């Protein structure tokens, strides 16, 4: 799938080590979903680690067209479903296995460099 991004619309404070506090108006990076109820969003601004945030506390959008999926109803299991299905977003389990196997020793490419923007 493509590097989709989600934006928090409500302040969701973490509860356990498997949860990450978020605020309304923040930028999070989606990694996977869970039964179309929970979404795996990570911090983009600050630096800490991946957590867990419900779809009812986030808004699926696109860095290319954030105004396209800005009207969508994440709450509606139907809408969120078509989105996750269309974009072909991986699930939590799939994400865990992917990262686990990806971290292991295998073929890869050293070439490649990425960085974060910075203005004002």
């Amino acid at each position: 799938m493509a590097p989709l991004f989600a934006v928090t619309l409500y302040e969701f404070k973490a509860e356990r080590d498997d949860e990450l506090d978020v605020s309304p108006g923040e930028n999070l990076s989606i990694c996977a979903h869970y039964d179309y109820e929970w979404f795996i969003a990570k911090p983009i601004n600050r630096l800490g680690g991946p957590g867990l945030v419900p779809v009812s506390y986030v808004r699926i959008i696109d860095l290319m067209d954030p105004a396209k999926y800005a009207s969508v109803d994440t709450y509606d299991r139907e809408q969120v479903m078509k989105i996750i299905d269309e974009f072909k977003i991986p699930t939590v389990e799939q994400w865990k296995d992917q990262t686990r196997r990806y971290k292991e020793s295998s073929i890869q490419i050293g070439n490649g460099h990425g960085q974060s923007q910075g203005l004002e």
């Binding site: 109820e37 419900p54 865990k96």
Partner: peptide, 16 residues
């Protein structure tokens, strides 16, 4: 994985 959200799915701010 440590990412098993077995918790319930919360609803949006509305009068159900």
């Amino acid at each position: 994985g440590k990412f098993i959200p077995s918790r319930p799915a919360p609803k949006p701010p509305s009068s159900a």
